[PDB]
């Protein structure tokens with residue numbers, strides 16, 4: 001009946017395809033790559049997955065995160081440590097940290113790999129009275145009634161929707177991330193533990209199967225001559241003097257499976273749709289990962305997208321309502337992440353010092369309340 005073309009088979013595209021199908025819309029999913037660390041899916045994200053029929057993925061693969069702590073970088077002592085039980089009670093779902101690999105594999109399995117066309121890199125969309133068409137680098141094309149551009153932070157379709165080409169803004173820090181086996185010599189196995197100091201941080205969080213998702217953050221200029229070959233040396237020098245658990249992590253990680261990402265965001269857009277085409281996921285909003293809401297927001301995007309089509313077939317009207325519901329939400333998330341990034345990574349070391357001070361006096365009430373505000377502001381409340 002109604003055909004949606006979905007570009008991108010990441011969290012966004014697969015969630016959108018699942019949501020559109022829930023609403024009786026047939027989706028063909030296209031993905032540029034020919035084949036193939038972790039994210040923390042907070043309760044708003046979890047509730048969305050559950051709404052989408054993918055609740056089992058979260059529950060099964062979400063690591064046992066039960067409490068959190070911040071530790072002094074030099075001494076390794078707790079500044080604050082507390083349970084997240086109240087977070088779970090107030091929001092109705094637990095936070096589910098999950099390895100990217102497993103999450104991708106499970107979502108693809110849920111949708112169906114044979115219903116995704118791989119090696120299809122979109123370059124262009126065109127809309128006429130009757131529908132929309134896309135072209136792929138391999139020379140092929142495809143037509144449908146609706147187009148979902150979930151093609152990522154470097155989205156090729158975004159400029160057609162906005163009429164100009166947004167540029168990524170370097171956020172001023174570098175993130176190294178990966179997975180290691182759990183060891184209490186590093187930190188507790190059911191805890192989100194972060195060492196903070198010097199505008200840097202080192203974080204450990206449990207995913208499934210007795211592993212930690214880890215990440216190192218260092219404020220630095222973009223473009224340094226660093227990669228997996230210099231990796232262990234880079235970390236050793238950026239985290240010189242840091243408590244023993246940090247040195248132990250640097251020694252346990254495998255540089256060859258560790259990722260180095262220069263963190264960017266994009267100034268928020270005031271538009272998400274044009275005619276039969278909607279931006280979704282990173283294509284429509286690209287945030288620093290500082291509050292862990294990028295993947296969550298893509299899932300939220302999909303829930304709303306599905307909702308607006310549940311009882312209409314007026315595409316332009318449905319997308320205008322999608323845009324109305326999502327635009328201010330994702331603007332706030334991007335900006336809130338940016339603020340958190342600047343505080344955590346020493347944009348103004350005094351504010352950052354002030355923050356460390358707050359962490360020493362922190363009972364968890366404040367942190368949990370802030371987390372709830374972000375979560376409860378999502379579409380499923």
Ligand SMILES: Cc1cc2nc3c(=O)[nH]c(=O)nc-3n(C[C@H](O)[C@H](O)[C@H](O)COP(=O)(O)OP(=O)(O)OC[C@H]3O[C@@H](n4cnc5c(N)ncnc54)[C@H](O)[C@@H]3O)c2cc1C
Nearest residue numbers: 008010011012032039040122152281282289292294295296
């Ligand atoms: C370091 C880091 C930590 C993060 N931590 C968290 C977290 O803790 N919690 C959380 O919720 N989120 C987190 N995120 C964000 C989350 O990873 C992303 O927001 C989410 O994966 C975005 O999904 P997406 O489908 O929109 O984009 P992508 O995953 O980038 O998918 C887009 C897909 O489109 C394909 N594609 C690109 N161009 C084309 C084209 N021209 N034609 C066809 N296909 C194309 C790509 O191959 C890709 O598969 C983190 C991100 C980073 C970088």
Ligand SMILES: [Cl-]
Nearest residue numbers: 289292293294
């Ligand atoms: Cl994020």
